[PDB]
Ligand binder design. Structure first.
Ligand code: XK2
Lengths: 99, 99
């Protein structure tokens, strides 16, 4: 679809058997999810945003379905205020920005 | 232009007679520029990101030219690490997300 940006561009995802909604985010290099149970191992990472740094767990090869589109990739889980889909997964579902 | 997202979607903006590059950010509701001196009167506001919150000054009715398309709106200025064009202006320049 085409998303105009008068609304937050939110979409439904499934990950880990759970249903979430997440923001489509061109400024975010990677995907960050609020606190979740993910099957696997993880690495600690910190990322920085507007107000500072947060510590997240990196999990790799996680399957997500963003609308009816599957992508596999890295997901960071942490204390974000909002679930964010970033450019690592956006490229996989073929998203573009047009003006 | 159609921007694919294998690299950061950065564009050249002209604001207050200065030239700057800024990230096109669909996740961000508003536009936040790094400290820059920009003429007029303003209010303080606090915005929250990942990591937490920064105090910004906000100026309304600022002219921006974003990739050589004009718009006028609110610009927040404050200690952001990257200049962000958010939805408030993305909407005026007609941007859409497509997948
Ligand atoms: O903090 C934000 N980040 C950090 C971010 C997020 C995920 C990441 C994943 C991997 C690596 C880095 C990441 C960084 C990005 C902007 C940004 C990018 C790079 C450096 C600094 C900032 C994001 O693109 C932007 O939409 C929002 C996401 C968000 C939305 C809502 C609530 C929390 C976080 N803001 C706050 C942001 C940005 C601008 C705003 C303007 C007005 C009002 C609120 C604003 C909030």
């Amino acid at each position: 679809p085409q998303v105009t940006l008068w609304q937050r561009p939110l979409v439904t995802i499934k990950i880990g058997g759970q249903l979430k909604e997440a923001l489509l985010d061109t400024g975010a290099d990677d995907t960050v999810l609020e606190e979740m149970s993910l099957p696997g191992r993880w690495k600690p990472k910190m990322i920085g945003g507007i107000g500072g740094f947060i510590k997240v767990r990196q999990y790799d090869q996680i399957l997500i379905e963003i609308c009816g589109h599957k992508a596999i990739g890295t997901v960071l889980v942490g204390p974000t205020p909002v679930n964010i889909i970033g450019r690592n997964l956006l490229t996989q579902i073929g998203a573009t920005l047009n003006f």
